[PDB]
From a paper:
[name] is a cannabinoid receptor-like class A G protein coupled receptor (GPCR), highly expressed in pancreatic β cells and intestinal enteroendocrine L cells, playing critical roles in glucose homeostasis and feeding behavior. [name] elicits its physiological responses by coupling primarily to Gs proteins to activate adenylate cyclase and cyclic AMP signaling. Here we present the cryo-electron microscopy (cryo-EM) structures of the human [name]-Gs signaling complexes bound to AR231453 and [name]-2982, two representative agonists reported for [name]. And both agonists, AR231453 and [name]-2982, adopt an extended conformation to bind in the similar binding pocket, demonstrating the conservation of the activation mechanism of [name].
The complex was formed on the membrane of insect cells in the presence of [name], which stabilizes the nucleotide-free complex by bridging the Gαs and Gβγ subunits. The structures of [name]-Gs-[name] in complex with AR231453 or [name]-2982 were determined by single-particle cryo-EM with overall resolutions of 2.87 and 2.33 Å, respectively. [name]-2982 shows positive results in phase II clinical trials of type 2 diabetes by successfully reducing postprandial glucose levels in type 2 diabetes mellitus (T2DM) patients, and increases insulin and incretin levels in a 4-week phase II clinical trial (ClinicalTrials.gov Identifier: NCT01035879). [name]-2982 contains five linearly linking moieties, ethylpyrimidine, piperidine, thiazole, phenol and tetrazole. Compared to IRL2500 in human endothelin ETB receptor, the deepest depth of orthosteric ligand penetration reported thus far, [name]-2982 penetrates within the pocket 1 Å deeper than IRL2500 in the pocket of human endothelin ETB receptor. The 2-fluoro-phenyl ring of AR231453, or the phenol ring of [name]-2982 stacks between F157ECL2 and W2657.39. While for [name]-2982, the tetrazole moiety forms hydrophobic interactions with F71.35 and L612.60, and is close to two polar residues, Q652.64 and R2627.36. Three hydrophobic mutations of Q652.64 (Q652.64L, Q652.64Vm and Q652.64M) all reduced the agonist potencies of [name]-2982 more severely than that of AR231453, which is reasonable given that [name]-2982 is closer to Q652.64. The thiazole moiety of [name]-2982 overlaps with the nitro-pyrimidine moiety of AR231453, forming similar hydrophobic interactions while without any hydrogen bonds. The ethylpyrimidine moiety of [name]-2982 overlaps with the isopropyloxadiazole moiety of AR231453, forming similar hydrophobic interactions. The ethylpyrimidine moiety is critical for [name]-2982, as its replacement by other moieties completely eliminated the agonistic activity.
Author numbering:
A (entry chain B): 13 to 351
B (entry chain N): 1 to 129
C (entry chain A): 9 to 60, 205 to 254, 262 to 394
D (entry chain C): 8 to 62
E (entry chain R): 5 to 212, 220 to 300
Write the structure that this text describes.
């Protein structure tokens, strides 16, 4: 009865939205960038190799100074490295070893991590006495934590396998806001440059744009075939890129409200695990299950280069805020720095 | 957007025959293994049958061997289930389900509650008028 | 540049302290063995825990050897993402309630989950210890033939008990036949793939406090031995 | 599950009201941004080894 | 002259095929971390030093018959190759012991194995090899008291030397060697049988040998056949006053003893999966430059 009527309403609304999207698609990105000169050959080399993790690494994050970084391994360790001179700055043992994400605060005073324990732990690095200690444990998710990112020293946004996202207040330790609407595990998130919006990707093959203050979804983007594993904004904040289990990467425009370009090749049949842009946004770097990383031309969808120095699955990737270097982490327990 | 629509089904007397169709859109059909799953009144989801990418490998659950036949046409992106010798134990809602990822042999969560890559299902009732 | 030299010296000293601590932690990590316990709603995994958040941990010791077993707590019933965390464990312990052949078909669901685990690309080197639990209920249901194993598994008609079967004392031949048919169902999946990189170790359990941990200990020893033997081209 | 279908329909209504610019303008904007920042990207245009922190 | 060219070509082959293995194993150790690779690198270094020591015996054998060799130089020159060969033999024995301990006591092996133990074992091994090679110089009755101008083995060393080694070092060790692998074979057999049993049962549900023996045979034949003729003929020579052996022992059986150092890299390095993959990766490096 009413359920069938609601289904019909939903189908008609989807048809209308698709019609509007087709109406706005007057041209493509390939036709417009036809006369642009190619980047050429990108040949990056390994400058550092950071050793010391006992088991596979899942996550890393650069500090805002573009020198220090933090890495998380499922041996139970969070390690903070000085990428200059390779020396280890900190080594934090965790209560639970099944960590799946880590984040480094922009101020440089805190780090965060979580995983299969369904808890987000905050560690203070600038304590007066003794080594680093846990300062806060955010609980309330009913599934594993997949990603976290600091907004300020007092705000953090987390994504979970319970199909929701949350915005916390660190001092009180309570969920300030909850973001619902996804139907699968939320695998990744990325904050906008102004920290007013953020995007999330889930195991329902869809991405969502969320307003931080109002706590509501602005736009939904479809076009992938399988689960979305990674996501990141374009430098100007008007577009973003997604990597999927369907062995493709995709570019979506916020104002055009649809997909712009697809990056794929016939010989790539493995999933993407991580994506990132270069400083100017011309290059798109993607990590793959076939042990390698690909450097794509973001405007012409041509493969410009390959980073091929890992013996196991590439799990995480990150570009410094100054655009000087790229860092890759792998299941072989090593971290590599490229430029 | 991934989309699966199931059609066919209705009232049928015991011993009758029926055919269910599944139309797929939004993905490369030939790269995925496909599944038929069912949910009976007041029971959980139950796996029924599966067919591989090329259709060479086919599997059925024990209680439907000899009566159900699964087939697929990659050219028209369609999946078919031919049901023969139906019994009142077959009254259920039937769903068309896709493997989560392409180019794989494992198929994890097709019978889970709120699985993403599943259709809305179609009702099959077997009763003597 | 003097303060720069002092900063380098302090950073190096901190790095050496961290590296010594990491050496100790490496020793500890290599010593212990990690297990993943996976069951079902009523498979009896809690009894296995009793014999002895998002995840629960049980620690035990056999012959001065340390085992840490992890079981999933508050996670959703979709596993294809978090199962990947357990590609480095020494074993997955898979608990199956064998009496519930008549969701109304839980044995088939266990077989599907076992097939998915066995054929996952990231678990291609992980061995499985299979615990077929609740043998008393299986025997009680077989002897009182109210519900037949047939017409859920039509092949059971053409099944004969293996000549190498070792029945427990006071077992009807029908109960032994049923047990070994159920075990052969899993062996059909586990012996078709692997190329000798990982194996399945099935056991029959009803209720023993100290035999199950001994079985796990022996299975882990066999797993390590087979890996070493395969390294040396002796297997 | 009518109470969830209502939420889905309301979300579709809220997402169907936005105004979308042409794809050509968005592509032009992205291309212009990439052009305006080309000289500031170390990974696109290599820099001399003296200015490279990682040698 | 012919002895000179044979020694030159064999030394060149040994040095090249062992330095390649050493480089590959060092790279793998720079990537991975194991003590078995440490022992393999020690074996490669020992064989390389054998090659260098053999190369150190070419001038007088090729084009210096006129120049006599002083007693001091000849004794050390002879004593160097013996120390190198003893180092290779002891390294093989240590590798076998490591494998046997890993299979026989798996949990305790994981418990008590570390880089410090491997380093201590290697240092003790090298010290023992040098002692075996040099201590007989300061022990009377192990030397000959007649003439030292014509430098060669059995001209400065008494035969009893090899005999005592033959009764203290080689034959017991070989027995131990065999014993270890026999034990391992037994264990392997058991596992194999069990596996086959399971593969039968599933094969019924689906509706439808001598690998260890040949591996063990290859290992035992490589360890035993290389030096046994030399030691046996030395015992025969000590038994009877027959001078005819003095020459053959110096130029035929010792060649098999040396070729042991060519048989070792193929069996203990090339037969490994990771080492062969590293060699394949190094193959393109020389081509592309
Ligand atoms: C467990 C302890 C152990 C360690 N190692 C071993 N073996 C067997 C005996 C060793 C010997 N090596 C020798 C030296 O033999 C020769 C040298 C040079 C010539 N030359 C001819 N013309 N120029 N040089 C001829 C003969 C004489 S015993 C070598 C390795 N056994 C036991």
């Amino acid at each position: 009865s009413e359920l069938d009527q609601l289904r019909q309403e939903a189908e008609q609304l989807k048809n209308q939205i698709r019609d509007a999207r087709k109406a706005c698609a007057d041209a493509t990105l390939s036709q417009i960038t036809n006369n642009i000169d190619p980047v050429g050959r990108i040949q990056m080399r390994t400058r550092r190799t950071l050793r010391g993790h006992l088991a596979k690494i899942y996550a890393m994050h650069w500090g805002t100074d573009s020198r220090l970084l933090v890495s998380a391994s499922q041996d139970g360790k969070l390690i903070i490295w000085d990428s200059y001179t390779t020396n280890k700055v900190h080594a934090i043992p965790l209560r639970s070893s099944w960590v799946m994400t880590c984040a480094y605060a922009p101020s440089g005073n805190y780090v965060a991590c979580g995983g299969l324990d369904n808890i987000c732990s905050i560690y203070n690095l600038k304590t007066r006495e003794g080594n680093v200690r846990v300062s806060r444990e955010l609980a309330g998710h009913t599934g594993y934590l997949s990603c976290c990112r600091f907004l300020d020293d007092n705000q953090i946004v987390t994504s979970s396998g319970d199909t929701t996202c949350a915005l916390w207040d660190i001092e009180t330790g309570q969920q300030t806001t909850t973001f619902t609407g996804h139907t699968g595990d939320v695998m990744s998130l990325s904050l906008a440059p102004d920290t007013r919006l953020f995007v999330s990707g889930a195991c329902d093959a869809s991405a969502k744009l969320w307003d931080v203050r109002e706590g509501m979804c602005r736009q939904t983007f479809t076009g992938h075939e399988s689960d979305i594993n990674a996501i990141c904004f374009f430098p100007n904040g008007n577009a973003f890129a997604t990597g999927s289990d369907d062995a493709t990467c995709r570019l979506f425009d916020l104002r055009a409200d649809q997909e712009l370009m697809t990056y794929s090749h016939d010989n790539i049949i493995c999933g993407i695990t991580s994506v990132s842009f270069s400083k100017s946004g011309r290059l798109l770097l993607a990590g793959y299950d076939d042990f390698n990383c690909n450097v794509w031309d973001a405007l012409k969808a041509d493969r410009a280069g390959v980073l091929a120095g890992h013996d196991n699955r590439v799990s995480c990737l990150g570009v410094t805020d100054d655009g000087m270097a790229v860092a890759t982490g792998s299941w072989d327990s090593f971290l590599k720095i490229w430029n | 957007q991934v989309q699966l629509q199931e059609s066919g089904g209705g009232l049928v007397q015991p011993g009758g025959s029926l055919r269910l169709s599944c139309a797929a859109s939004g993905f490369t059909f030939s790269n995925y293994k496909m599944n038929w799953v069912r949910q009976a009144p007041g029971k959980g989801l139950e796996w029924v049958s599966d067919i591989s990418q090329s259709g060479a490998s086919i599997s059925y659950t024990g209680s439907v061997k000899g009566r159900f036949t699964i087939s697929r046409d990659n050219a028209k992106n369609t999946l078919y289930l031919q049901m023969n010798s139906l019994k009142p134990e077959d009254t259920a809602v039937y769903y068309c389900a896709r493997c989560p990822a392409p180019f794989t042999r494992d198929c994890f969560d097709v019978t889970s509650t709120t699985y993403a890559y599943r259709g809305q299902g179609t009702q099959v009732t077997v009763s003597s008028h | 540049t003097e303060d720069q030299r002092n900063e380098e010296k302090a950073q190096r000293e901190a790095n050496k302290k961290i590296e010594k601590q990491l050496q100790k932690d490496k020793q500890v990590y290599r010593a212990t063995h990690r297990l993943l316990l996976l069951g079902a709603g009523e498979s009896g995994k809690n009894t296995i825990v009793k014999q002895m958040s998002g995840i629960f941990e049980t620690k035990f010791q056999v012959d001065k050897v340390n085992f840490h077993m992890f079981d999933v707590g508050a996670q959703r019933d979709e596993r294809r993402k978090w199962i990947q965390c357990f590609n480095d464990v020494t074993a997955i312990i898979f608990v199956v309630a064998s009496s519930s052949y008549n969701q109304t078909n839980r044995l088939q669901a266990a077989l599907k989950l076992f097939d998915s685990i066995w054929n996952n690309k990231w678990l291609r080197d992980t061995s499985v210890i299979l615990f077929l639990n609740k043998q008393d209920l299986l025997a009680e249901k077989v002897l009182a033939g109210k519900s037949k194993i047939e017409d859920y598994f039509p092949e059971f008609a053409r099944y004969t008990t293996p000549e190498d079967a070792t029945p427990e004392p006071g077992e009807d031949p029908r109960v032994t036949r049923a047990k070994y048919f159920i075990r052969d169902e899993f062996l059909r999946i586990s012996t078709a793939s692997g190329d000798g990189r990982h194996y399945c170790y099935p056991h029959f359990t009803c209720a023993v406090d100290t035999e199950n941990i001994r079985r796990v200990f022996n299975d882990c020893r066999d797993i390590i031995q087979r890996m070493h033997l395969r390294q040396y081209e002796l297997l | 599950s009518i109470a969830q279908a209502r939420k889905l329909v309301e979300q579709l209504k809220m997402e169907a009201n936005i105004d979308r610019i042409k794809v050509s303008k968005a592509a032009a904007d992205l291309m212009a941004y990439c052009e305006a920042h080309a000289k500031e990207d170390p990974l696109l245009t290599p820099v001399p080894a003296s200015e490279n922190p990682f040698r | 002259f012919s002895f000179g060219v044979i020694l030159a070509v064999l030394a060149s082959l040994i040095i090249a095929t062992n330095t390649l293995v050493a480089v590959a194993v060092l790279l793998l150790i720079h990537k991975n971390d194991g003590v078995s690779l440490c022992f393999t690198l020690n074996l490669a270094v020992a064989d390389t030093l054998i090659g260098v020591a053999i190369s150190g015996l070419l001038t007088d054998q090729l084009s210096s018959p006129s120049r006599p060799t002083q007693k001091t130089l000849c004794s050390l020159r002879m004593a160097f190759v013996t120390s190198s060969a003893a180092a290779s033999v002891l390294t093989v024995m240590l590798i076998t012991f490591d494998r046997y301990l890993a299979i026989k006591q798996p949990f305790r092996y994981l418990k008590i194995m570390s880089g410090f133990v491997a380093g201590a074992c290697i240092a003790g091994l090298w010290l023992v090899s040098y002692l075996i090679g040099f201590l007989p110089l300061g022990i009377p009755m192990f030397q000959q008291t007649a003439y030292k101008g014509q430098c060669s083995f059995f001209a400065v060393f008494h035969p009893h030397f090899v005999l005592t080694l033959s009764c203290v070092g080689f034959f017991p060790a070989m027995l131990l060697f065999v014993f270890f692998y026999c034990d391992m074979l037994k264990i392997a057999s058991m596992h194999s049988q069990q596996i086959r049993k399971m593969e039968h049962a599933g094969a019924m549900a689906g509706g439808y040998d001598f690998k260890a023996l040949r591996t063990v045979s290859v290992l035992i034949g490589s360890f035993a056949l290389c030096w046994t003729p030399f030691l046996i003929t030395g015992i025969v020579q000590v038994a009877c006053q027959e001078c005819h052996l003095y020459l053959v022992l110096e130029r035929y059986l010792w060649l098999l003893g040396v070729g042991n150092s060519l048989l070792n890299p193929l069996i203990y390095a090339y037969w490994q999966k990771e080492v062969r993959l590293q060699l394949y990766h190094m193959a393109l490096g020389v081509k592309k430059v």
